[model samples]
Each structure stands twice: as structure tokens, then as C-alpha cells.
Target: GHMNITDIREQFPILHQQVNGHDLVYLDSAATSQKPRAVIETLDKYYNQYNSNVHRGVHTLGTRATDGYEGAREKVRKFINAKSMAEIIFTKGTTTSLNMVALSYARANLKPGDEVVITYMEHHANIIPWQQAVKATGATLKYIPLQEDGTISLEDVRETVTSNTKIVAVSHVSNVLGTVNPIKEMAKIAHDNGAVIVVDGAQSTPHMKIDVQDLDCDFFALSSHKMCGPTGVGVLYGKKALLENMEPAEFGGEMIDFVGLYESTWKELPWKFEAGTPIIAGAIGLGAAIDFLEEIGLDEISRHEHKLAAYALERFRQLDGVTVYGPEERAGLVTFNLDDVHPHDVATVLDAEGIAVRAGHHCAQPLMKWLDVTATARASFYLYNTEEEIDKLVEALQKTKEYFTNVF
Candidate 1:
């Protein structure tokens, strides 16, 4: 069935506005997606209708708030198809979620001689956590070489996973290069070598359907903002038995099951990980965002973005000095550079034309070194975006090129 672009566009109220005398063409979904009305309204409704603290309240408003907050947890569990609701724990964002695994799981399991394996295309959030973990625990960090096409080779996966490998962490999709990694195969190889796999799903969760059980990973992390929800909220999905054994990254009120004068025991599973008063409205908004995406169907959204990426890639390549990075089989984003113009300058000109794109190292400095560039511009797509918007982006790029040439 064909997606109704009209209906899809109607859901996002922010899309109808104009900026700087031109209609806004947002191409920065990879960084953070614009929230739909449903997601926004849910947050508003929660605050206006039932504003109270969760889990610790004895009043009616408190109970209602608790139900809404916990209900969102259940929604998250269903979203990833985790085996149990106890597996889903909320954190600040993808970075925090990955850090929890590094601090809690890796720090406990890794020894002086053990190795933590990752790939060359990892974002700083994925890389720094393990680097710090290795430094703290006297463990070694290893990298799997990327193929020329900017994709990780399965042969590299095999070579990287040895008996000394205690943990293997990789992104489900590259945030900069936009390559969808083979996490299932990677997880199998890690398991065969007695290593646990931790997946950073910050990129893939927004654009594709995810099943943590199907991937068979020991831990998975994702951000809510990238998937049409509010920022500052994320999920860390860990295997039940593993999470139970791991130490809590934070401690205080609410996460404890019993407390004594000088000692305390933490709560089980999810609550044990969340120590403070959690993001109440953020979780509600995330639940609504999940509902919104499922209502539109993730497969449909993915297909739409793929078609948009193909069109954008084809047209952008026709530009005189444009060079796109990543494999031909890329995901929804196209990272590129204009002949000699800095990506920041390119983004500035695009913004003048009411087109928004991301311009920077995109939290992947290692990937920047691999691509041998200081910075790059990225145009990402979603279901609400159209080919017409890509046309605007190309026209703006040409204008930017001409303007820069005149100045030079």
C-alpha cells in the first residue's frame, strides 16, 4: 500500500512553517527527528491532567502518574520485543545507556588480559565508554577494520573475536556513514567465542523495525529523540540474568528495596538501575511516539526513507564537486562534502534557504579520521520528507557553492 504523504505531513505541525522567507525543509532526522502532534500533545496532557511524582506517591494523582510511567516501560519492552519488561531500563540517552553497560557489565567482567572488541566506524559515545572501561580495568580495546566501502567485513568480525574477547560492542547502524551493520551475525560470532554483544541502536531504532530477541544481543541501547520523541530519555535493554548480576551505576532514593542505617539493598531489575525520579512526561511522550510509529508501520516508514535516500543520492551526485561517503547500500542519510567548502559554511547557507542539515564530525571523530576529513554535512530523511525537499537542498547547495566561489 502506498503511504499517504498528505496524512503523514498533517501529523507534524512544525513542517508547515516557513523560515527566513522560504518553506522549511528539514533534513536532520539523523540528529533528532521533529516530534509529531500526538507525541507533543501526550506530554502536554500528562502535565495538565495528571502532574505528580511516580511510585512514591500515595494520592490518586501519584498513582495515575505511576501507572503512566510504568506503562511507558511496558511499551518500550514491546517496542524492542524484549523477553521481559524487567529488561528495559531508562537512562538519559544513548550515551548514558552505553556507559551503563561499560560501567556495570564490562567493568565487572573484564580482566587485565581480556579484550573488548569494537569496529572502526563507532561514534565517540560507543568508543569512549569502552576506552575508559579498559583504562579503569586494565583490559585491552581492539578494533575490527572496515572495508573500503565503509562497511565492516564479516572476515574482520571472525578475526577480531578470540577467546580473550570478553565483550563486543558495535552500532546496529552507523550514525555518520549510514551503513546498517550485521548485528545478528556479529552477535552469533561473539556468543561462539564466549563474549557478550552490546548494540548501540541509536541510528537503527529510528528508521527500522527492531527485535532485540532476534538479534540475540546481551545488551542494546537507543535514544528516544531520534525516533520522534523528546530528548533526555533513552532505553537500555539488557538480558534479565545479566542485569540482575550487574551493579547499579547510580544510587539514592527510589531504587532501593530495603534500607538500613548504614547499608541498603537495591530493587530488582529495571528499578534497580533507575535511582532517581525518572522522566515522567518524557516517557509518556516516548510511549505516544512509539504508538505513532507503529500506527504508520515501521516497514512503511523504512521503505519511504529508502526511496528518499536513493533520490537524494542520485541528484546530489550530479553536483559538480560533491563527494558522498559510505557504501552504495547506505541507510536513510547521505554524508557528503562540497569541493573545498567547509561543512559548517555549507550548513549556514542551507539554513538561509530554510533547509536544515547536520554539519560536524557527528560525534564520530574516529569515523572522521577514517574518512580523512575534518567535518562533513549530512542530509537525512524520514517519512514526512519528500523528493521536493531534496530538490530544495540541492538548489541551496548550488547557491552555497556559487556564493563561496564569488567570495574567494
Candidate 2:
């Protein structure tokens, strides 16, 4: 069954709007996706109907809240095809999820002379946490060399992994270059070398199918807002045994099982990690988002984006003086630079034409250095976007180039 892209676009109220007297063209889903009516309604209904804290609540509202919040976790567990609800721990977002592993798991397991391997194309969320981990644990940090096309080579993966490597953290997709890494194979290599692989799935989860069990990663991190849900919520999916062995990153009201004046015992599995009042409304919205995506089908979404990205890449290459980074194969995004125009200037002119695209290092400053550029303009796509929108983007970009040329 084929999906109607136009029909999907209509589900987003934000897409049917005007900016600066021009129809808005959003090419920044890679930053944070716009919410559909389904997700928004889910949030509103939660707050208006069952506005209460979750857990330890005997009241009707409290029970409803608890069910909605925990139901979201089950939805998440099914979405990723995880083995147990005990494996799904909610946090603020991908940043928090990744940091939780660095602070809790890596901090405890790593020691001096151990190595933590990552790549050049890591989001700061993925990069900084390991840097902190290595600093605290006296573990040596290592980098897997990237291919010239920005993709990681399994050859490099093998070389980076050694007997002394305790952890290998990598992104499922490069947020800047849009490279979809071979995490499953990489995980195998990590395991072969006695290291546990941690995957940052913030970019990958939104546009494709994910099976943590299939990938065999010890931990996976993702953000709900990137997948058409409300902000301020994220997930950390850890193996049941791994999470059980780890200490809670936070200690507070909800996560505590028993508290003594001098000693405190924590709750079981996922609950132990969730210390504060959880994101009750956000979780419900995420559940709705998961429902919406499942209806469309994850494979359908991935197919749509691949075609969109290939089309965009083909069009950008046809234009003179526009240099697009990453391989011909990419995840629904084109990170490019126009000759003699800074990415910020390119973004500003596009904004004037009612186009929205991300312009910066995209929280991958290390990748910027590797790409030998300060910043790049990125046009990312989602199910709601169309070839027509890309046409508008190309037109605006051409106009921007012409206008900047005239000024200088």
C-alpha cells in the first residue's frame, strides 16, 4: 500500500501556515519534527483530563496518569522491539539518555588503561559524555577513522576495537553527514573484542526501523521530539542484566524503594533510573506518536526519505558551486555549502523566502573540523515534506546565491 505524502502533510497544522507572506517550507525535521494533531491532542487530553502525578497514587486521576505514563513505556518497548518493559528507562531526551550511560555504566565499568572508542562524526551529546567518562575513569579515548565519504568502514571498526576496549560508543546515523552506520556489525566487532557497544539513535530512530535485540547493542538512546512527539522526553534502552548491574544516576522520591538515614535501596530495573517526577504528558504524546508512525509503517517512512534524499542530492549536484557533503546514500538530509556564501547567510536568505533549514555545525563541531568547514546549511526531510518543497528550497537557494553575488 502506498502512502499519500500530501495527505500526511495535512496532518500537521504547523505545515499549513504562512511565513513572511510565503508558504512555509520546513526542512529541519532533523532538528526537531513538527507534531501532528494526534500527538498534540494526546498531550492536551492528558493535561486537561488526567492532570496528576504518576505512581503511588490511590486517586482516580493519579491512576490514569500512571497508566498513561507507563503505557507509553510499553508502546516504546514494542516500537523498538525490546525484550522487556524493565529495559526501557525514560529521561529528559537523547542527551540525558547518553549521559546516563556515561555517568552510571561507563563510569563504573571503565578503569585506567581501558579504551573508549568513538568516531569523528559524533554529535556532541555522544562525544562529550565519553570525554567525561574517560577523564573520570582514566580510560584512554580512541577514534575510529572515517572513510573519505564520511561513512565508517568496518575495517576501521576492527582496528579501533582491541582487547583493552571496554566500551565502543557510536551513532546509528551521523546527524551532520547523514550516514547510516552499520551498528549491528559494529556491535559484533565490539563484542568480539570484549567491549559493549552503545548506540546513539537520535537520528536513526526517527526515519527507520529499530530492533535493539537484533542490533545487539548494550544501550541505545533516542529522543521523542525527533519522532513527532512532545519535547523534554527521551528513552534509554539497556539490556535487562546491564541495567540491573548499573547504579541509579539519580536518587530521589520516585526511584527509591526504601530510605534509611544512612543508607537507601533503589527500585527495580527501569524505575531505579527514573528518580524525579517523570514526563507524564510527554510520555503519553510519545505513545500517540508511536501509534501514528506504526499506522504509516516504519519501512514506508524509510523508503520515502531515501527517495527524498536521493532526489535532493541529485538536484543539488546539478547546481553550480554548491558542494554537498556525505555519500550519495544518505538519511533524508543534504548538508551543503554554496561557494562564497557562509551557511548562516544562506540560512538567513532562505528564511526571508519562508524556508527553514538548519545552519551551523549541528552540534557536531568535530565533524566540522573533519569536513574542513566552519558550518554547512542542511535541508532535512520527513514524511510530510515533498519534492515540491525541495523545488522551493532550490529556487530560494539560487536566489540567495544571486543576491549575495550582487551585494559583493
Candidate 3:
């Protein structure tokens, strides 16, 4: 079915607004996506109609809250095609989810001289957790080097992942470079070497269809806000066997099954991990976000973004003295820098034109170091973004270049 892009655009109220006296052009979906009215209204309804605590009270409001919370879990489970809801653990965000695996799973399993492998293109969320885990466990942290084009090779995966490797954590997509990784192949390599693979799906989950089972990754982490949901909520999908064996990183009121003076029993697989009050309205809004994405279809979204990527790449290339990072075939973002202009300056100039883009190391300092640049400006497209926006961006850049050249 053909995607009605205009119809889809109308669902987001934020996209229709004006910024700085110009029509707002949001090209920063990689940072955080704008929410749809469905998700916003879902949050509204939850707070307005049935605002209460979950899982403890036998009252009607509590039941409604619990249903909304747990029902969101089912939507998430189906969104990623996990085996069961028991395997899905809601966390603060992708950062917290990855940290759970590191602090709990990796810290428990990794021994002295054990290797934890990752790539250079990883976000800090993926990198720092492993670093902390390895430091505590006396394990070695290894990086699978990137090619000149920023994509990782399967051969590199095979070479870096050895018998001593305990965990291979990599981002399923590069947030800065927009490079889509081959997690399925990497998972096979990790399994072949007696290691488990953890996928940082913050970037991948929003842009593509995800099947955790089909990818065979032992754990996957994703953020709700990146996919048009509310903030402060995300998911950690771990294999059932792995999750059951791992101890919960948090302990508090809700996660316990039985509390005693000396000893306490934790609850079942998913609940054991969730401590204190969960994000009630956030989860419900995420469920609504899942509905919004599913209605338009992930395949259509992927296709639309790819088309946008191709168009943006071509337009960026046509500009003189502009260097675009990442591979030719990539996701819907283009990270580039204009000659004689800092990324911050480029972003400032674009902002004057009401074009929003990300400008910085983008929390992937290691990747910036690898790319041999301090920072770059990134224009990331989403389902609602159009080629016309890219034209505006190019025109703005031309003006930016002319302005900078004349001043210098």
C-alpha cells in the first residue's frame, strides 16, 4: 500500500507549527522524534480518566492502570517479535536498558581475562556500560575497527570475537553515521564463539522492522521517545533463559515477591527487574506510539527514509566544499561539515532558517575521533520528512557558505 505522507504528517501537531517566522523543518529525528497526537492523547486520557498506581490495589483505577501498563508490554513484545512478554523489561531508556545488561548480566558472568567486544561506531550508552562492566570484572574491552566508510565487516566481527569473548555488544545502527549493522550475522559469529550478542537498537528499532528471534541476539535495547513515544521509557528484550538466570540490578517496593527481615524473594522474570513505581502514562503513550507506527507499517517507513536518504545524499554531494560522512548506502541521516565552518556555526545558520539539525560529537566521541573530526552537523529524516525540506536545507547551506566566505 502507498503511504499517504501528507495524511501521516497531519498526525503530528508539532510539525505544522512555525519557528523563527518560518515553517519549521525538523531534521533531528535521530535525536528524538516528535510525538503524534495519538500518543499525546493517550497520555492525556490516562492522566485524566484513570490516574492511579498499578499492580497493588484491587480498585478499578488500579486495574485500569495495570492493564494500560502491562498492555503496553504486549505491544512492545509484538513490535520486536520477542518470544514472550516475560522477556521484555521496561527501563528508563536505552541507556538504562544497556546498563542493566552490563551491571547485572555482564558483571555476573565475565571473569578475569574475558573479552567484551564492541565497535567504534557505538554510542556512549553502548560503550561506557561495557567499559564499566569490564573494569569491575577484570575483563578486556576490545573494539572491532571500522572501515574507511564507517561500516563494519563480517570478517572484522569474526576476527575480533574469539574464544575468550563473553559478550559482543554492538549498535544495530550507528546514530551518528546512520550505518545499519548486520546484527544477524554478528549474532551468528557471537554464538559460534560461545558468546552472546547484545544489540543497541535505539537507532535501528525506529527505522526498520525488528525480529529479536530472527536476529538471534541475546539482548536488545530500544528507546520509546525515538520512535514517536514519550520520554523516560524504553525496553530491554533479553532471551528468557538469560533473563531468568540474571539477578535484578534494582531492589525496592514493587519488584519483590516476598519481603522478610533477612531474606527476600524477587518476583518473576520481568517484574523482578522493575523496581518502585513504573512510568504509568509513559508506557501507555508508548503503546499508542506502537499503534501509530504499525498502522503506517515499518516497511513503508523504511522505504520512505531510504528514499529521503538517497535524495539528501545527492543534494549534499552537489554542494561545493561539503564533506558528507558515512557510506553511500545508509539510513535516513547525513552527517556532514562545510569547509571553513564549524558544525555549530552551520547549525546556527540553519536554525536561523528554521531548520533543526543536530550539531556536535553526538555522544559518539569515539566515532568522531575515528572520523578525525571534532564534530559534524547531522540532518536526520523521519517518516513525515520530505525532499522539499532537503532543498531548503541545501539552499540554507549555500547561503551559509556565501556568508562565511565573504566574512572570512
Candidate 4:
């Protein structure tokens, strides 16, 4: 991908410091990415210079805040190539975004005997919401079975989504398996069955160039925190037609247009969905993050991750006891277990070596069960990650295995 790795690493201040005794090697990017100085400074500037309520006042600070917030919305629109700004709704994160789709849109539209289709690879954010929605609306939830390599086939997807299916919700990339699903083809199948597709883009958007228009997905959701932006903010993108028909998931304050004793009217497209005081600083920070990522190019980031994955897989092949999961062609993460060593123990040893990796089911419990493991350790990469850091990881794992083996 021809990235200036040294220059890129300089942008993240946290990476320079020592954790425990050694230089920190962050490999938990899939859970949440470390922020760059650009985003951090953007947030600091917003609070330090002009912090005010947005879309309510004509004062200068208010206007500036409003501009920054709304301007961020435009950035998000262009980032994902949404048709218009109206399609984007700011929320807490991808979790809240998916809940809005399930609670408001799915619950409102689903009927008894209708179906909602998803896969075992879905995170709890994508799973629980649909579970509750179907329970509330008397609709059934169906799962598309995954293949032996932890990837779902288009044939299985086509068969799973039938005429009765009202919505097909799936992750664009599996957080545990790193398996990238074909959202465009899945969307086509869902549409052919008179169903809408909702994409959990939390994993995919950070590393890949997303064209929701090209994917033809009815809805897509992502968290800003996963893309070097601040936490507590994300985006929900729905087709204007669908958003217009769907009711707001939240209410009051900015979401209202008019209110009477008995009746109330809601505000316009995006605002109606964003209630109360908006996430101004977080959105602004996300805009800065967008700028940072775009400066490097998403395609470049994707390619870099592919190389990292390939290298890590090749290195893992040298370790006899390591059992890696997921397909051959996967994303930036590697999920695996050490023989006779708990994932918690693996992560503990890695953390001691100043290499941070996630050591659990990664919120995809169903996928964990499908993989026939209680838990697995994952080392996820981002643009800031280096081959040197991965080499450290492999070294740390060797120590972990020897220590565990001797102890047991």
C-alpha cells in the first residue's frame, strides 16, 4: 500500500509511550481504534474555542458549533457516499444505530409470520435488537448457516432469505473471524425477496472504502470510535424513503417541529432521528478522523491490513500449538487459541509483554459457539500498526506458550 508507517505512527501519541516496561503495541483495533492527534486536537479546539448548543441559537459560538456539527454530517455523507445528508443520523454508536433500525423500523414494519434473517457471525449489537424486535412484532428470526471456513455462501444466503423475510441484517465483516461478507450480493437477494438489507458496518467502514450506494444496502451503521474518532458517536444511514416512512427512535428537544397538549409533529429527516443536545464534539472529531483517513486513502489502508494479515498468518504457521480461525482471505484481524491455554491467559501474557490484544468472544458469542470454542484471542490491526509490532506479538506468544506449558 506504500504507506509511510513511521510517519503514520507519529500521529498517534499513545503509541510512543511504554506500557508496563516495553513500548506499547496496540493490536486491539477491532474493539476500538486509538485516536490520532488530528482528531484529538479537533475535539480540544471545539471545547476550547467554541463550545455551545447547536441548531438553536443565532449567537456566533452557537453558529460555529452548528456549522462544525452539520459540516461533520456532510463529511460522513461523502465518506460513505450516501445520496444526501438527510440519510445520515448521528447516534451513540453502531450499537444504538442498529437498535434504532430494529426498534423503530423493524418493529413498525414486521408482522406475524414475517421473518428477519441474519447470520451466526453477527455481534450482539446486531443480534439482540432483532431478537427483541421479532419477539415484540411476532415475526420469526432466521439464520444463514456459515460454511466450514466460517464464511457464508451466496447460495445459503439466497435460500435463507425467502418471500416471508422482511429484513436481512448482517455484519459487513466478522469481528471474530475477519470474514468479509458480500453485502452487495446479499442485498440483491434480499431485494429480490422483497426485503430490505441492514448492514452492520462497524468492522468494515474503518478499513475499507464504503460505497453504500454501490452496495445498494437500505441501511448501514458504523461507530466513529472504530475509525480513530472519539467514542460516544456514530452514524446511521438509511435510504431517505425508508427513513421518511420509519418513525423516530428517540424524541423531544431538537427532534420536534411542533407540540400541543395532545399531539406533536416531528422535525425533518435527520434531525427527527437525533434528539436532545447532539453529539457535537464527537461528530466534529469524527470529521477530523475522516480527513485523516482520507488523506492516507482507505484503499491503501485496506491493502496494508491485507499484508499484515498475510504476514501474521504466515508467522502463526510456524507456531505448532496456535489454532487460527476464519477463512483464507480475511480482514485485518487474527482470532485464534493456544493449545491447552485459555484465551484469557494468552491475552494476559501478551499484555505483560506490552502487546494489547482482545481475549474473549469479541461480542460474537454465536460465532464463538460455531467455531466450537468458549473464547479466542484476537489481534486486530490498523494503519498505525507495523510488521515490527506483529513480530513482537509472535515473540510474546512463544513466551506465553512456553510459560503455560511449563506451568501445566
In order, candidate lDDTs are 0.92, 0.93, 0.94, 0.95
> How do all models score by TM-score?
0.98, 0.99, 0.99, 0.99
Pairs that clash in candidate 4: none
Worst 10-residue stretch by lDDT in candidate 4?
1-10
lDDT of 2: 0.93
Backbone clashes in candidate 1 total 0
Which lDDT tens digits does candidate 1 get at residues 153-264?
8889999889999999999999888899999999999999999999999999988999998999999999999999999999999999999999999999989999999999
| Global lDDT of model 4 | 0.95
Clashes of each: 0, 0, 0, 0
Better of 1 and 2 by TM-score: 2
Over 1-408, each residue of candidate 3 has an lDDT whose tens digit, in order, gives 879889989989999978899999999999999988999999999989998999966999999999999999999999999989999999999999999999889999999989999999999999999999999999999999999999999999999999999999999989888899999999999999999999999999998999998999999999999999999999999999999999999999899989999999999979999999999899889999999999999999999999999999999889999999999888899999999999999999899899999999999999999999999999999999999999999999999999999998
In candidate 4, stretches whose alpha carbon ends up further than 4 angstroms from where it belongs are none
| Leading candidate by lDDT | 4
In candidate 3, stretches whose alpha carbon ends up further than 4 angstroms from where it belongs are none
lDDT of 4 by residue, 1-408 (tens): 468989999999999998889889999999999998999999999999999999966899999999999999999999999999999999999999999999889999999999999999999999999999999999999999999999999999988999999999999999989999999999999999999999999999999999999999999999999999999999999999999998888878889999999889999889989989999999999999999999999999999999999999999989989999989899999999999999998998888888999998899898889888999999999999989989999989998899988887
Report the alpha-carbon TM-score of model 4 versus the true structure. 0.99
